[PDB]
């Protein structure tokens, strides 16, 4: 029965705050010192009642319903058993709010917003006020003994909550005791020893005063020992077991508090005996713990030397291999200071500095993890660089000046560029082979992230790059060969680009550094090299007008552009595919347009105009063959098409006729007499562009436009005359490669022009009984018999080119050329499959507007099942 009733009360009991809990959990402006004076005074009056209130406060903070009674705490030999019973009661409670930590992590949502701050303040000062009331020293005071007797068993029990709050109470005690021991030393005993040593002479030692000094010096040291005694204990009872608690949060509190003991009291704590704890938890399975140790190490940076000798390896491994990027990044940050300190071997340095190179696109403006990780690697790189500089210049005196800049600058640039290249070489070993293109793009990117550290070298890199003399002197990577120049300009371009996309930077800064040298750079770099052309034009294209006027260099833009146009003029351009030059020039032309200055536009408008004039010359003089097409395309047609993307190109009746009659319509005869490599570069892309510009006129209205219609009608007739020649039984070159290539490239431009025309025609209102009538007048039917026949032959060539790669057996119409069974062609950029799909897509596009002979082109489906999944997809 007695037991029944106890079980009964246990069951119907609900959560009731104790008095001390209430004041601590709800007071928003509390004098915690007055509070402690009251409680600690009560200890001396009624020990049991204080102890009870203390533990019940702990129980309230964990949201426990259970409570001790004054008799429960009467005996200190009961403590383990009683905590045992509390543990039983608290395990039985199904639901429990951890108020202390809800206050901490969720003040806004918490029933007791101030509870956490008050609780840590209270337990942190507890032991100070104890001292004020002479409860601490008295041999250890029984206050302390009492407190440890109950905190110890609670700190190792099976309830995480009780374990956390006891451990935190113990640690808060130690925050103070550790401060207090040194306090006693440096501020009391030291002050009294001095005055024990100065009141010794002159042969007049006060003797009664030399007795009062040894007296309090002896008291104070006795109490320094009682204090260290409790410090030893809390380590022995708590930290040494709690640092590896199964709960990660008690482990991180252990690291946070040990760091404080270390700052408070290094003579006790700055020793490998305690630092190992950080190093061990470096291998903790929890991301949170590894993060927490890693944030503590910088603060902590001979005990420390021994520490990094023992743990740097693990720190390196984290920065390289850790499953968590935020952690990896933290590691790199620690490695900054280890390097700064000389604790890193050279191979260990490279393994980190080469991390600045990464295959993935990482944006320099982002606040993401990836971006912040590269940024902390750039920080490491910056520090290695500075160390090497000091090491290099340590004995040396350099000249006031090397290679047109301060000696010290030239060295810094040479050391930087050298580490950049050593680092790259490492990166490149750590991964599968990549081509020069990807190589440059990855370097370009690293340079972006280095802008915050090497940005002040931008001006001197420009000047070093325009130096005419030899790169030596009585003593480093310098722009001495062609690979080193490319490294320099890519790195200049990446630095500069990174500087204009860096967030939070004031306007015009990168421009203040490069625009003064930009004319000289274009005037002097080896821009015949497309890699060098790409980097310098890329620098040019970084800047908006506001950049040029601000810097005072708006005046230079035209002379620079003139150089750009002369380099444009001196080159030979290919049809655009994978041509680094075509791409650089194209972007430059766009950029200039985008600046919006008529004076500049005119430089390009006049260039188009000269090109036209000279083409007409070439046309009437030279076409009255491999050389002819080489020149035609290399010096005239590919360049008008490039410029044509940005500025209007129009052939006037005269030139257009010259071009259509002497070239375009004679393409079949011209082609039979060229070499393969020359046939490969034959196309009519310019004809599609001329058209597009006219279509632009027509849409920039919607009253028809005459000669503008005569122009495109005439361009299309030209396509017809080719298709007639090409599809006729008189074509003795039918069936050959060269014949396929011409049919194919001619078809691609034709399809683009016709689709463009039909989409326009359908976008004119019935309202427009003059436009609609004139379009059908000139173009309908859009695709003629011979055009249908050529597109089908082109399709069939591509289909067998892809089929044959796997020796697939195609079905065929009865008079379908069976020689298609043997065709082979290695000449396509990204493979036969790609060209089959694209052509078939262009054919689908026509079919959807229904411009194709549906009966004829049913044929594209005959082998859908033989051609793989993609083709089959495009057919659906």
Do residues 500 and 435 touch, judged by C-beta distance below 8 A? no
Instruction: Return d(Cα 674, Cα 680) in angstroms, integer.
Output: 10
Half-sphere exposure of 554 (CA within 13 A, CB side): 12
Q: What angle do CA 446, 585, 742 make, to 5 degrees?
A: 115
Residue pair 535/493 in contact (Cβ under 8 Å)? The answer is yes
Tokens representing 503 are: 């967030």
The breaks in the chain (C to N more than 2.5 Å) occur after 138, 301, 475, 624, 702
Contact at 8 Å (CB) between 319 and 328?
A: yes
With 0-12 CB in 10 A as exposed, 13-18 as middle and 19+ as buried, what is 671? buried
d(CA 482, CA 70): 88
Contacts of 286 (CB under 8 A, 6+ apart): 248, 251
Q: 548-574 b/e with 16+ CB inside 10 Å = b?
A: bebbebbeebeebbeebbebbeebebe
Return the beta strands (E) in 236-278 as ranges: none
Question: What residues are paired with 406 via a beta bridge?
Answer: 401
Own/partner pairs, 625-632, CB within 8 angstroms, 24+ separation:
625/670, 625/673, 625/674, 625/678, 626/674, 626/675, 626/678, 628/670, 629/670, 629/674, 629/678, 629/681, 629/682, 630/678, 630/681, 632/663
CA 727, CA 789: separation in Å to the nearest integer? 6
The token pair that represents 683 in the structure block: 């196309």
Rounded CA-CA distance 96/90 in Å is 9
Name the residue among 330, 262, 260, 250 with its Cα closest to residue 290.
330
Collapsing DSSP to helix, strand or coil, 401 comes out as strand
Strand, coil or helix: 402: strand
d(CA 85, CA 88) in angstroms, rounded, equals: 5
Q: Give the N- to C-terminal CA distance of the chain in Å, as an integer.
A: 84
Tell me the two tokens of residue 341: 């300190």
At what angle are helices 47-61 and 142-155 packed, to 10 degrees?
30
- For the record, the structure tokens of 395 come out as 């004995």
Whose tokens are 């700055």? That residue is 270
Residue pair 776/761 in contact (Cβ under 8 Å)? The answer is yes
How far apart are the C-alpha atoms of 457 and 460, rounded to whole Å? 5
Q: Is the peptide bond before 362 cis (omega within 30 degrees of 0)?
A: no
Report how far residue 258's alpha carbon sits from residue 171's, in angstroms, rounded to the nearest whole number: 9
Burial class (CB in 10 A: 0-12, 13-18, 19+), 123: buried
Structure tokens at 845: 């596009």
DSSP H or E stretch at residue 405: strand 405-406
- Pairs from 37-41 (Cβ < 8 Å, separation ≥ 24): 37/129, 37/132, 37/133, 40/126, 40/129, 40/130, 40/133, 40/135, 40/143, 41/133
The conformation of residue 97, written as its DSSP 8-state character, comes to -
Q: What is the distance of C-alpha 340 from the center of its chain?
A: 25
Give 31-40 contacts, CB < 8 A, sequence gap 24+.
Answer: 32/118, 32/121, 32/122, 32/125, 33/125, 33/129, 35/122, 36/122, 36/125, 36/126, 36/129, 37/129, 37/132, 37/133, 40/126, 40/129, 40/130, 40/133, 40/135, 40/143
- DSSP track, 462-475: HHHHT--S-S-S--
Q: How far is CA 685 from CA 350, 633, 644, 648, 682, in A?
A: 49, 11, 11, 15, 9
DSSP letters spanning 481-538: SHHHHHHHHHHHHHHHHHHHH-TTPPTTHHHHHHHHHHHHHHHHS-TTSHHHHHHHHH
Q: Strand pairing of 401-402 and 405-406?
A: antiparallel
DSSP 852: S
Name the structure determination technique: X-ray
Total Cβ atoms within 10 A of residue 441: 15
Stated resolution in angstroms: 2.6
| Tokens representing residue 64 in the block | 């426990």
Peptide bond into 781 cis (omega under 30): yes
Which tokens belong to 734? Answer: 């039918």
Centroid of chain to Cα 268? 43
């Amino acid at each position: 029965s007695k037991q029944d009733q106890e079980t009964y009360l246990e069951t119907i009991k609900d959560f009731q705050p104790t008095e001390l809990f209430q004041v601590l959990a709800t007071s928003e402006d509390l004098s915690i010192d007055e509070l402690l004076r009251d409680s600690l005074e009560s200890y001396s009056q009624d020990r049991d009642r204080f102890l009870q209130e203390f533990i019940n406060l702990l129980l309230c903070c964990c949201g426990a319903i259970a409570r001790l009674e004054v008799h429960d705490v009467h005996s200190n030999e009961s403590s383990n058993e009683t905590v045992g019973e509390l543990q039983l009661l608290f395990q039985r409670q199904k639901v429990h709010e951890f108020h202390l930590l809800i206050s901490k992590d969720s003040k806004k949502k918490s029933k007791y917003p101030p509870l956490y701050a008050n609780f840590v303040e209270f337990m942190f000062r507890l032991m100070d006020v104890a001292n004020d009331l002479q409860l601490l020293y008295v041999g250890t005071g029984p206050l302390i003994i009492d407190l440890l007797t109950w905190l110890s068993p609670l700190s190792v029990c099976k309830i995480r909550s009780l374990r956390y709050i006891a451990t935190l109470t113990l640690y808060l005690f130690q925050d103070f005791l550790t401060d207090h021991v040194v306090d006693l030393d440096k501020n009391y005993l030291s002050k009294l020893s001095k005055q024990l040593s100065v009141e010794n002479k002159k042969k007049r030692p006060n003797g009664k005063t030399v007795e009062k000094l040894e007296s309090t010096i002896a008291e104070i040291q006795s109490s320094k020992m009682v204090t260290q005694g409790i410090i030893d204990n809390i380590i022995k009872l708590c930290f040494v077991h709690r640092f590896k608690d199964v709960d990660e949060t008690i482990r991180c509190e252990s690291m946070v508090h040990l760091a404080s003991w270390t700052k408070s009291f290094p003579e006790y704590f700055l020793k490998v005996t305690f630092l190992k704890y950080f190093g061990w938890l470096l291998s903790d399975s929890s991301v949170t713990v590894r993060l927490q140790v890693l944030k503590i190490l910088p603060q902590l940076i001979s005990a420390v030397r021994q520490f990094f000798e023992r743990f740097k390896e693990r720190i390196l491994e984290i920065a390289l291999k850790d499953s968590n990027l935020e952690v990896r990044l933290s590691a790199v940050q620690v490695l900054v200071e280890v390097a700064s300190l000389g604790y890193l071997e050279d191979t260990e340095i490279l393994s980190i500095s080469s991390l600045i190179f990464e295959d993935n696109e990482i944006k320099v403006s982002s606040l993401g993890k990836n971006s912040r990780y590269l940024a902390s690697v750039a920080k490491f790189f910056a520090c290695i660089t500075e160390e090497k500089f000091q090491e290099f210049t340590n004995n040396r005196v350099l000249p006031k000046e090397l290679f047109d800049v301060k000696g010290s600058s030239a060295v810094r640039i040479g050391i930087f560029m050298n580490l950049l290249n050593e680092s790259l070489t490492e990166y490149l070993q750590k991964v599968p082979q990549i081509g020069s293109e990807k190589r440059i793009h990855i370097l370009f990117q690293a340079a972006e992230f280095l802008y915050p550290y090497f940005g002040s070298l931008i001006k001197d890199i420009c000047k070093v790059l325009t130096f005419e003399g030899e790169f030596t002197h009585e003593s480093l990577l310098l722009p001495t060969d062609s690979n080193n120049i490319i490294l320099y300009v890519t790195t200049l371009h990446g630095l500069a680009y990174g500087g204009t996309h860096m967030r939070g930077q004031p306007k015009f800064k990168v421009a203040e550094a490069v625009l003064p040298h930009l004319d000289q750079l274009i005037k002097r770099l080896p821009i015949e090299s497309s890699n060098v052309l790409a980097s310098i034009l890329g620098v040019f294209n970084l800047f908006a007008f506001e950049d040029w006027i601000h810097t005072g260099y708006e005046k230079d833009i035209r002379k620079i552009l003139e150089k750009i146009i002369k380099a444009f003029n001196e080159s030979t351009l290919t049809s655009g595919a994978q041509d680094l030059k075509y791409k650089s020039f194209s972007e430059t032309v766009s950029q200039v347009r985008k600046l919006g200055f008529n004076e500049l536009d005119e430089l390009w408008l006049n260039h188009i105009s000269q090109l036209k004039i000279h083409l007409g010359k070439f046309l009437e003089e030279k076409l009255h063959n491999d050389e002819n097409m080489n020149t035609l395309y290399g010096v005239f047609l590919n360049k008008l098409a490039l410029l044509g993307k940005v500025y209007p190109i129009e052939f006037q009746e005269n030139l257009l006729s010259l071009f259509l009659n002497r070239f375009v319509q004679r393409l079949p005869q011209i082609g039979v007499h060229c070499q393969l490599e020359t046939i490969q570069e034959i196309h009519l892309k310019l004809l599609a562009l001329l058209t597009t510009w006219q279509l632009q006129k027509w849409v920039d209205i919607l009253p028809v436009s005459e000669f503008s219609l005569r122009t495109v009608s005439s361009i299309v007739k030209s396509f017809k005359v080719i298709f007639d020649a090409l599809s006729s039984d008189t074509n003795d070159n039918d069936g050959t490669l060269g014949d396929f290539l011409l049919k194919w490239s001619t078809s691609n431009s034709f399809i683009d022009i016709i689709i463009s025309l039909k989409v326009f025609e359908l976008g004119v209102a019935e309202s427009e009984k003059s436009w609609r009538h004139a379009l059908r007048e000139n173009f309908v039917p859009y695709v003629t018999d011979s055009a249908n026949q050529v597109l089908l032959k082109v399709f069939l060539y591509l289909e067998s080119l892809f089929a044959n790669e796997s020796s697939e057996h195609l079905d065929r119409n009865p008079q379908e050329d069976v020689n298609l069974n043997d065709i082979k062609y290695d000449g396509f950029g990204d493979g036969c499959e790609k060209e089959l799909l694209l052509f078939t897509i262009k054919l689908k596009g026509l079919m959807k507007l229904g411009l194709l002979d549906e009966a004829l082109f049913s044929r594209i489906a005959l082998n859908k099942e033989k051609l793989g999944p993609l083709y089959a997809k495009v057919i659906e």
